[PDB]
Amino acid sequence: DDCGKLFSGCDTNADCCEGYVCRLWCKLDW
């Protein structure tokens, strides 16, 4: 539910919910 965060790297399971990218950071769709 909580999943990854903004800029929070690129975790496996916590692979930051759909919204941001998986670049250097889990930042917004840059």
Swiss-Prot record:
<keyword id="KW-1015">Disulfide bond</keyword>
<keyword id="KW-0800">Toxin</keyword>
<keyword id="KW-0027">Amidation</keyword>
<dbReference type="InterPro" id="IPR011696">
    <property type="entry name" value="Huwentoxin-1"/>
</dbReference>
<dbReference type="GO" id="GO:0008200">
    <property type="term" value="F:ion channel inhibitor activity"/>
</dbReference>
<feature type="modified residue" description="Tryptophan amide">
    <location>
        <position position="30"/>
    </location>
</feature>
<dbReference type="GO" id="GO:0005246">
    <property type="term" value="F:calcium channel regulator activity"/>
</dbReference>
<keyword id="KW-0872">Ion channel impairing toxin</keyword>
<feature type="disulfide bond">
    <location>
        <begin position="16"/>
        <end position="26"/>
    </location>
</feature>
<protein>
    <recommendedName>
        <fullName>Kappa-sparatoxin-Hv1b</fullName>
    </recommendedName>
</protein>
<feature type="disulfide bond">
    <location>
        <begin position="10"/>
        <end position="22"/>
    </location>
</feature>
<keyword id="KW-0528">Neurotoxin</keyword>
<comment type="similarity">
    <text>Belongs to the neurotoxin 10 (Hwtx-1) family. 19 (HpTX2) subfamily.</text>
</comment>
<keyword id="KW-0108">Calcium channel impairing toxin</keyword>
<feature type="disulfide bond">
    <location>
        <begin position="3"/>
        <end position="17"/>
    </location>
</feature>
<comment type="function">
    <text>Inhibitor of voltage-gated potassium channels of the Kv4/KCND family. Inhibition of Kv4.3/KCND3 and Kv4.2/KCND2 is strongly voltage-dependent, while inhibition of Kv4.1/KCND1 shows less voltage-dependence. Its binding site may be near the potassium channel voltage sensor. Also blocks calcium channels.</text>
</comment>
<dbReference type="GO" id="GO:0015459">
    <property type="term" value="F:potassium channel regulator activity"/>
</dbReference>
<keyword id="KW-1220">Voltage-gated potassium channel impairing toxin</keyword>
<keyword id="KW-0964">Secreted</keyword>
<keyword id="KW-0960">Knottin</keyword>
<dbReference type="GO" id="GO:0005576">
    <property type="term" value="C:extracellular region"/>
</dbReference>
<dbReference type="Pfam" id="PF07740">
    <property type="entry name" value="Toxin_12"/>
</dbReference>
<dbReference type="GO" id="GO:0090729">
    <property type="term" value="F:toxin activity"/>
</dbReference>
<keyword id="KW-0632">Potassium channel impairing toxin</keyword>
